[PDB]
RNA sequence: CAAGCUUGAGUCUCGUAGAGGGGGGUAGAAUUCCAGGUGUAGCGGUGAAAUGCGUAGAGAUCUGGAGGAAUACCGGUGGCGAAGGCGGCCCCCUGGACGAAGACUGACGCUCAGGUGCGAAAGCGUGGGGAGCAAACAGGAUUAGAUACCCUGGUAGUCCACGCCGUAAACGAUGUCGACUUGGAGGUUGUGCCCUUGAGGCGUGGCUUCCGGAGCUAACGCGUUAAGUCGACCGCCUGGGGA
RNA sequence: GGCUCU
Ligand SMILES: [Mg+2]
Ligand SMILES: [Mg+2]
Ligand SMILES: [Mg+2]
Ligand SMILES: [Mg+2]
Ligand SMILES: [Mg+2]
Ligand SMILES: [Mg+2]
Ligand SMILES: [Mg+2]
Ligand SMILES: [Mg+2]
Ligand SMILES: [Mg+2]
């Protein structure tokens with residue numbers, strides 16, 4: 001999974017209160033971090049289908065969270081995907 | 089998911105009667121309150137009561153006559169999958185007039201008989217018999 | 218970092234070389250910024266069953282807080298050393314320090 | 322990477338290339354080159370001794386260190402190169418003192434790794450140390466038969482030799498053929514398999530691809546006259562005789578080993 | 593009745609041989625939990641410790657191989 | 659089942675002890691179990707019928723302990 | 729449409745259990761093979777036999793070596809996983825579940841045609857490997873016959889890597905999600921409290937087995953893990969063959 | 972041990 005310090009480094013980076021931990025950008029960036037960490041895992045372990053299911057769960061959750069953010073406030077969506085380097 | 093509270097309300101009533109439950113509680117609503125207002129006025133339940141502030145809990149005191157249940161039959165008519173609207177001429181007679189049809193009209197929630205006397209129809213929520 | 222428990226089983230004719238191995242392994246750990254928690258020579262001990270056509274061995278227990286890289290180096294050292302017969306490294310949740318029931 | 326070619330023409334229909342992008346796309350290291358004049362399978366008498374050899378592309382010889390004598394001195398791997406003289410890729414290495422050499426490239430070897438020969442060498446793929454210093458059960462290549470003679474065993478693209486035993490002066494080897502052979506325990510060997518393991522996965526596709534490699538066509542013997550071959554003759558397709566060489570020696574099964582000098586070094590033959 | 597529930601250990605040590613010999617039979621087989629009444633959490637810990645002591649020749653795999 | 663005949667021990671005693679120990683460790687039934695291959699269907703089936711026999715026999719023994727027969 | 733709210737959903741913190749997956753190692757027992765020692769006429773197999781192995785010394789036994797595959801006991805109507813399925817031990821990478829207190833976001837949710845992905849065994853392809861088992865096949869018996877059951881052998885295959893196939897009584901023959909409705913005895917896994925005055929006493933969560941009440945059902949039976957009472961969405965059925 | 976049909 002993702003480490004504790006990396007979690008708190010994200011929470012303090014994108015949290016308005018450094019303790020919100022449940023904001024939409026926080027959950028997105030935590031997903032994007034674990035996904036980009038697991039690109040190297042599944043490049044080496046391509047037959048770990050059981051782990052890929054947890055990865056696709058992260059992707060689908062991030063897409064739903066992003067779509068909520070998009071229709072809730074677009075400018076946060078633009079600032080977020082610009083900061084995270086997301087194609088959509 | 090909880091797509092429909094009104095049918096959850098009716099189902100908790102129906103199972104309460106079949107279980108000989110004294111009272112039935114559920115999360116409250118403005119509409120569930122207007123329906124329990126109707127069911128108390130028409131005589132099927134004794135009393136309703138809503139308690140709590142942030143998330144209110146509606147408690148219904150059920151009614152039993154001669155041991156057995158008052159509410160013989162209760163059914164949902166309009167549903168999220170299929171809404172039912174009727175005009176004032178096409179309002180139903182539940183049990184030839186013995187039961188009632190809870191109707192939501194522009195002038196609030198009433199029975200079908202008062203909707204006809206009011207000269208206006210609306211959405212048929214439930215048949216209570 | 219990652220608390221490991223290392224036990225190795227030495228050829229009994231190399232019983233004299235045991236502290237030279239222990240001192241090298243300890244200087245490997247602390248040189249790798251590792252901690253050393255417990256360290257229990259058990260001496261020669263009669264095996265339950267004959268490994269490698271021989272009946273006795275020299276046991277060494279070690280509780281360690283090191284990075285995993287020097288532990289993989291230590292494993293390769295056990296692999297290519299012919300003095301060590303068996304090596305077992307078992308990951309532990311925490312650092313244990315109390316003496317073993319058989320050093321007693 | 323094997324690459325199946327698209328069938329834009331017959332002759333590319335069945336071609337499988339073996340593309341390695343890490344090989345140097347330039348000229349080889351010039352001091353280590355020499356002339357390799359072709360022979361045509363012809364001896365000093367001019368006669369053809371071994372058949373089917375002739376033609377092919379011109380090939381320069383690459384001087385390859387098989388003896389591997391730069392002991393103690395570490396060497397970094399500069400680049401990998403193609404050798405037409407052999408199936409395995411070669412590695413241009415640079416010693417500390419400034420000497421460059423070509424070695425056989427092992428499997429996992431890449432540009433920038435450090436190798437080192439000698440007794441005090443470590444045990445990683447690329448190193449060369451005597452098999453009394455090498456642990457039993459390991460895969461080595463470029464194996465000497467005699468000490469200081471140079472590696473003669475396991476030089477082809479994907480080969481390796483297992484070390485199964487050791488009794489004093491000798492180690493017992495499991496050759497790639499399945500033969501178990503005794504070798505002196507002072508002979509050097511090089512760790513790891515040889516590189517281009519997917520070399521045998523290539524398909525030449527066409528006849529010219531063999532003529533590029535200097536393989537002249539093979540006439541099968543029954544398509545001849547009886548003066549030419551024992552199989553020859555017949556009015557139609559007739560073969561009523563046992564399969565022999567062109568010189569009348571049985572081929573299907575008959576053994577030809579006649580060395581009583583090296584029989585003590587052979588533990589078991591291949592099966 | 594379970595000793596590990598009574599003594600309350602967080603994890604069984606494979607090094608405690610006199611205990612593991614009070615939980616293996618003569619032929620080195622693992623005594624079942626029906627007999628000793630061990631809670632199955634500790635029964636799993638016990639088998640996982642015995643297999644380690646067998647690996648370290650602290651316990652035999654069987655009585656014969658000698 | 660490594661059994662040493664103790665000093666001043668009769669043979670029928672030590673033999674009966676050896677049959678006892680072999681029946682305890684379950685050797686004969688192990689070999690009878692391993693003489694032929696049994697599929698994992700058959701193994702899951704035999705274990706389910708063994709649990710149902712354990713269980714319906716425990717409840718039948720406990721139910722017949724209570725009520726009388728004449 | 730705008731602003732919200734926290735009960736749904738989700739995030740965070742600390743922990744627990746687990747044959748959950750992928751990769752790499754390693755151990756021991758046994759099988760067969762090879763070499764060798766003692767030894768000598770049978771062995772093996774069956775309902776009974778024979779084929780077969782054996783005086784060229786088997787079988788038995790002892791020592792040593794090789795190699796492959798699977799991991800007794802634990803082991804359990806036990807556990808995990810979406811399903812298929814997963815069983816020695818160790819490490820690396822890794823997914824999910826659950827619990828306790830809090831904190832946070834604020835409906836972000838459910839289902840899903842088409843689509844995409846996974847998907848037992850058998851089978852296919854390339855390259856390896858190959859102990860045991862074993863379709864095919866061969867021989868022996870049995871029989872009226874015996875292209876079989878039985879026996880002696882035994883090849884693909886079973887194993888590994890990468891691709892393909894995309895099916896099963898792929899079954900709980902019971903779609904997913906959510907809500908309500910009397911009980912009992914257990915199993916497992918957390919956790920709170922009481923003096924743990926013992927392995928006890930009182931609770932509170934998750935998963936699971938058996939019986940069974942109302943009710944349902946053609947009956948059998950299901951029965952808070954529903955086949956009960958309802959809601960949302962999907963898939964499917966319409967006489968037997970032909971098919 | 973196997974031992975068909977009506
Ligand atoms: Mg999580
Ligand atoms: Mg030729
Ligand atoms: Mg040819
Ligand atoms: Mg020809
Ligand atoms: Mg001619
Ligand atoms: Mg002639
Ligand atoms: Mg002719
Ligand atoms: Mg003819
Ligand atoms: Mg709150």
Ligand SMILES: [Mg+2]
Pocket residue numbers: none
């Ligand atoms: Mg708030």
Ligand SMILES: [Mg+2]
Pocket residue numbers: none
């Ligand atoms: Mg779905």
Ligand SMILES: [Mg+2]
Pocket residue numbers: none
């Ligand atoms: Mg579909």
Ligand SMILES: [Mg+2]
Pocket residue numbers: none
């Ligand atoms: Mg298969």
Ligand SMILES: [Mg+2]
Pocket residue numbers: none
């Ligand atoms: Mg195949």
Ligand SMILES: [Mg+2]
Pocket residue numbers: none
């Ligand atoms: Mg194959």
Ligand SMILES: [Mg+2]
Pocket residue numbers: 858
């Ligand atoms: Mg074979």
Ligand SMILES: [Mg+2]
Pocket residue numbers: none
């Ligand atoms: Mg057979």
Ligand SMILES: [Mg+2]
Pocket residue numbers: none
């Ligand atoms: Mg189907």
Ligand SMILES: [Mg+2]
Pocket residue numbers: none
């Ligand atoms: Mg199945």
Ligand SMILES: [Mg+2]
Pocket residue numbers: 899
């Ligand atoms: Mg099933």
Ligand SMILES: [Mg+2]
Pocket residue numbers: 901
């Ligand atoms: Mg079905």
Ligand SMILES: [Mg+2]
Pocket residue numbers: 940951
């Ligand atoms: Mg029942």
Ligand SMILES: [Mg+2]
Pocket residue numbers: 944
């Ligand atoms: Mg019904």
Ligand SMILES: [Mg+2]
Pocket residue numbers: 954
């Ligand atoms: Mg239902």
Ligand SMILES: [Mg+2]
Pocket residue numbers: 955
């Ligand atoms: Mg039904």
